[PDB]
Design a protein around this ligand. Structure first.
Ligand code: CLA
Ligand code: CLA
Ligand code: CLA
Ligand code: CLA
Ligand code: CLA
Ligand code: CLA
Ligand code: CLA
Ligand code: CLA
Ligand SMILES: CC1=C(/C=C/C(C)=C/C=C/C(C)=C/C=C/C=C(C)/C=C/C=C(C)/C=C/C2=C(C)CCCC2(C)C)C(C)(C)CCC1
Ligand SMILES: CC1=C(/C=C/C(C)=C\C=CC(/C)=C/C=C/C=C(C)\C=C\C=C(C)\C=C\C2=C(C)CCCC2(C)C)C(C)(C)CCC1
Ligand code: SF4
Ligand code: SF4
Lengths: 64, 142, 163, 106, 41, 80
């Protein structure tokens, strides 16, 4: 009810994030209330090998 | 109740090595660790070889702080044993460091207030403009 | 006459080099009987060496004061003359082959981005798909220009940058 | 001292080849980075990294030994066959003082 | 047979099949056509 | 010494503390989802700057960054 529908893919706009401008599905937008509610999941690894991350709702945007 | 250092404590049976215990340990500082060690057992030393350990609380000491954190973590690994740390300066003053909370800093203890932190997204820091002072490494909030 | 170079037939150094090579070959060719294998090998080698030196001197290729051939690479000097084959058409042949290769590889790597775990397809290739695309790229100049006018190759700035 | 072997411990099949890095469960999941290939290569022989089963490690070593000796024997056979088919070994044999050894013809 | 054909998509295949095809083709072109250094025209 | 910082980008995985070899940082109240901890650097006299806490931090981007500063007996890992 707060973030995008779960299962809907969205992109990232965190300027300092490995995943930037590319799309990734949302695991679960945290409804309990927190500054980084949207947990996005990516298939390709990063330099550290992590697949998921949580971002703020003022950063993510719509689909391509 | 954080326990303080107690001299005249027995030591484990060991022959010797060539690690640590230099001029630094006499005029600058030396670190101390104490832990239960029931069921007299065999252990490994971080700056030596294998040794035996009686039952009942026993105390050790080394040169560098990591040389004792390694033993604390080992003790985590195998059997649940709960050592502590101590500091020593030139004036003989002793300071207790690990664990101050008593619950192993990896776990929170009822309540405290930490420092050296700021509520800001990663990045988004200040450009070198207005940072001419540069105060070594800036806390960005002080 | 271009660049002070002379056609390679009138080069005394070129013919001197050919004679030198033939003498050096014959001096150790005379070591074997006309029936053995090494003798036939040296005979065939001399055959295609004489063929080297004869076939080059046709349609014109300039040799300099050293007598060795010198490739002319400027379009315009290969034109107004007969040197368009030195390096002018080989350029287009390599461009064709390199296009072909890149086109096939790109269409492969694109058609694999749709299925699950494409990484596997990059260590375990789709041999029949690669063979199909290998026998469909020899019209790539047609497909490239019109796929460019199409716009299906420009990514609309949706990639990872730092600045 | 006696002999102790097991019958059909690992069934012969071309499946485990289709999954490179099976011996390393960390690698068998999939090549998400180009480092996967280099770790596949740098760890295929690291028998004690596959699993802590020293029995399986000893079996792997005792098999790789035959795997090496087979290459050794094919190498010696290749040398002998080069000497046999194309070489001046008879010529060298009739006059070893000046004739030089040659066993490779391009 | 199936797992074998699947195995035949890795380094031991094209990368071997390829570059074997290419070495053979180039060597044959340089053998039948002995010494080219410029096009026909 | 080594100026260590902790940004708001954090989940409280308790990993950068069970990985630090010098027991430098603590974890005291944070309002999270399941664990609710945040790291903090109360003391730096013993931090050597090994950047072992930056390797285990899964936050993107990292929650802790060691601002390399000046060296000392503790910062140079000198038993002498
Ligand atoms: C950077 C590439 C390059 C460079 C450095 C040159 C350089 C040169 N060209 Mg050339 N040319 C080029 C590309 C280039 N060309 C291409 C792509 C074509 C195909 C259209 C031509 C077709 C061409 C012709 C037909 C001729 C030259 C000629 C020449 C020479 C005299 C310049 C001229 O044309 O008269 C003056 C230039 C006024 C603008 C000169 C050294 C001329 C020549 O052979 O010299 C006698 C000549 O007739 N060029
Ligand atoms: C070493 C020089 C060399 C040479 C002479 C060739 C020559 C050729 N390549 Mg090849 N290629 C090369 C290097 C080379 N390649 C390298 C280094 C790679 C990267 C591994 C490739 C990858 C490659 C691919 C993927 C394909 C070719 C194909 C072809 C053929 C298409 C050209 C053609 O027939 O026109 C038009 C008719 C051709 C005979 C194509 C082919 O196999 O044809 C079916 C094909 O699809 N090449
Ligand atoms: C006779 C054909 C044959 C076949 C079909 C297999 C098949 C297999 N072998 Mg094997 N092997 C063989 C001969 C064969 N081997 C011989 C002659 C030796 C002695 C050198 C070995 C020694 C050997 C060892 C030490 C191991 C295998 C292993 C394996 C399995 C996966 C590793 C692998 O092969 O990756 C591809 C190999 C490319 C060369 C796989 C099902 C591994 C295994 O058991 O999985 C745990 C393993 O560690 N093999
Ligand atoms: C003396 C050369 C040599 C020998 C004796 C072996 C022997 C062996 N290799 Mg190996 N390999 C070699 C060179 C060699 N390799 C080289 C140069 C590479 C590339 C770096 C590889 C990459 C490789 C891989 C990827 C694998 C093997 C594997 C194996 C084992 C199973 C292969 C088989 O079925 O038989 C086997 C004992 C398989 C294995 O599981 O190892 C136990 C396997 O997965 N090898
Ligand atoms: C009479 C008993 C006997 C005999 C004749 C051999 C003979 C041989 N063993 Mg062996 N071995 C034996 C008992 C025996 N072993 C026992 C009881 C053990 C303990 C299980 C071993 C463990 C062992 C190991 C670990 C190795 C050998 C190896 C070898 C080969 C050495 C390399 C070589 O010569 O190339 C070949 C000679 C051709 C004529 C050789 C043929 C090497 C091997 O495995 O080869 C594959 C190797 O490294 N053996
Ligand atoms: C021991 C390793 C070894 C090595 C490095 C070579 C290397 C070579 N061999 Mg050879 N060969 C070997 C073993 C080896 N052989 C064995 C064991 C046999 C017995 C079956 C042969 C039988 C053989 C024949 C009949 C011929 C060669 C030929 C050749 C040359 C042609 C290159 C080629 O296509 O090779 C092979 C390519 C992939 C294996 C080459 C330098 C050719 C040659 O030299 O011309 C006279 C030739 O026709 N070999
Ligand atoms: C792309 C690689 C390639 C290609 C295109 C060819 C092509 C050819 N090869 Mg060759 N060959 C290759 C690789 C290749 N080969 C390799 C890797 C080897 C080493 C094993 C050989 C060894 C080999 C031998 C020993 C012979 C050939 C022969 C031939 C010719 C017989 C075909 C023919 O005339 O029938 C009809 C064509 C149109 C109707 C032909 C043009 C034969 C030949 O020389 O021709 C007389 C022959 O004797 N090849
Ligand atoms: C960009 C680098 C480059 C370029 C442009 C060339 C270009 C050429 N090389 Mg070559 N070569 C190179 C690098 C290069 N080479 C390197 C690094 C080596 C070392 C391995 C060789 C070793 C080599 C040999 C041994 C031969 C050539 C030959 C040739 C010519 C044959 C053309 C042909 O096959 O007809 C057309 C091809 C398809 C239609 C050609 C003009 C051949 C030659 O001199 O002519 C007889 C020859 O036999 N090259
Ligand atoms: C013969 C001839 C020709 C041509 C042909 C061809 C077409 C060829 C080709 C070829 C090819 C197609 C090639 C390719 C290639 C590739 C390569 C050779 C590579 C490589 C590598 C490297 C070295 C790299 C490195 C790196 C990386 C990996 C990344 C990062 C950066 C660096 C640099 C580090 C013609 C007919 C025209 C004419 C006549 C002659
Ligand atoms: C004639 C000639 C010459 C001259 C030249 C000149 C004068 C110049 C130039 C140049 C230029 C001016 C170049 C350019 C470029 C541009 C651009 C803009 C680009 C691009 C690219 C693209 C478009 C892509 C393609 C592709 C790829 C890569 C992928 C796959 C395939 C394809 C095809 C798609 C010389 C003598 C030298 C040599 C011979 C020939
Ligand atoms: S740099 Fe090393 S010593 Fe300093 S806080 Fe991080 S892990 Fe601990
Ligand atoms: S390791 Fe990083 S994400 Fe995990 S609790 Fe420490 S600062 Fe937070």
């Amino acid at each position: 009810e707060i973030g995008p529908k779960r299962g809907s893919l969205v992109k990232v706009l965190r300027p300092e994030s490995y995943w930037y401008n590319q799309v990734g599905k949302v695991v679960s937008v945290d409804q309990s209330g927190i500054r980084y509610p949207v947990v996005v999941r990516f298939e390709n690894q990063n330099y550290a090998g992590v697949s998921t991350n949580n971002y703020a709702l003022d950063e993510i945007e719509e689909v391509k | 109740k954080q326990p303080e250092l107690d001299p005249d404590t027995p030591s484990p049976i060991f022959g010797g090595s060539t690690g640590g215990l230099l001029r630094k340990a006499q005029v600058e500082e030396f670190y101390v660790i104490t832990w239960e060690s029931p069921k007299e057992q065999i252990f490994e030393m971080p700056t030596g070889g294998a040794a035996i350990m009686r039952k009942g609380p026993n105390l050790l000491k080394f040169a560098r702080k990591e040389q004792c954190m390694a033993l604390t973590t080992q003790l985590r690994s195998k059997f649940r044993q709960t050592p502590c740390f101590y500091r020593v300066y030139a004036d003989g003053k002793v300071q207790y460091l690990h664990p101050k909370d008593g619950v192993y800093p990896e776990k929170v203890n009822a309540g405290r207030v930490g420092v050296n932190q700021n509520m800001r997204s990663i990045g988004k820091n200040v450009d070198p403009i207005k940072v001419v002072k540069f105060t070594g490494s800036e806390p960005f909030e002080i | 006459d271009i660049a002070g170079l002379t056609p390679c037939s009138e080069s005394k150094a070129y013919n001197k080099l050919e004679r030198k090579e033939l003498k050096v070959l014959d001096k150790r060719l005379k070591q074997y009987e006309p029936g053995s294998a090494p003798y036939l090998a040296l005979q065939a080698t001399k055959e295609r060496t004489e063929n080297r030196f004869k076939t080059y001197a046709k349609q014109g290729l300039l040799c300099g004061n050293d007598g060795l051939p010198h490739l002319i690479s400027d379009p315009g000097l290969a034109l107004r003359f007969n040197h368009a084959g030195e390096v002018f058409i080989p350029t287009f042949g390599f461009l064709y082959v390199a296009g072909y290769i890149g086109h096939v590889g790109r269409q492969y790597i694109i058609l694999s981005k749709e299925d699950a775990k494409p990484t596997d397809k990059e260590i375990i290739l789709d041999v029949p798909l690669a063979l199909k695309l290998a026998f469909q790229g020899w019209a790539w100049p047609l497909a490239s220009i019109q796929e460019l006018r199409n716009g299906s190759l420009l990514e609309k700035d949706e990639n990872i940058t730092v600045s | 001292v006696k002999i102790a072997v097991d019958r059909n411990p690992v069934e012969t099949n071309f499946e485990k080849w289709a999954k490179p890095g099976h011996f390393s469960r960390a690698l068998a999941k999939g090549p998400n980075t180009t480092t996967w290939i280099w770790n596949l290569h740098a760890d295929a022989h690291d028998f004690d990294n596959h699993t802590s089963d020293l029995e399986e490690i000893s079996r792997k070593v005792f098999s790789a030994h035959f795997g090496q000796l087979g290459i050794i024997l094919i190498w010696l056979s290749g040398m002998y066959f080069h000497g046999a088919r194309f070489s001046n070994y008879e010529g060298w044999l009739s006059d070893p003082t000046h004739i030089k050894p040659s066993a490779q013809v391009v | 047979m199936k797992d074998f054909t699947t195995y035949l998509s890795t380094a031991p295949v094209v990368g071997l099949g390829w570059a074997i095809f290419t070495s053979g083709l180039l060597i044959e072109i340089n053998r039948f056509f002995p010494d080219p250094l410029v096009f026909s025209f | 010494a080594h100026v260590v910082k902790i940004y708001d980008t954090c989940i409280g995985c308790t990993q950068c503390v069970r990985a630090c070899p010098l027991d430098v940082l603590e974890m005291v109240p944070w309002d999270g989802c399941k664990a609710a901890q945040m790291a903090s650097s109360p003391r730096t006299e013993d931090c050597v700057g090994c950047k072992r806490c930056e390797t285990a931090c899964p936050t993107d981007f990292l929650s802790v960054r060691v601002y390399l500063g000046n060296e000392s007996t503790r910062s140079l890992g000198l038993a002498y």
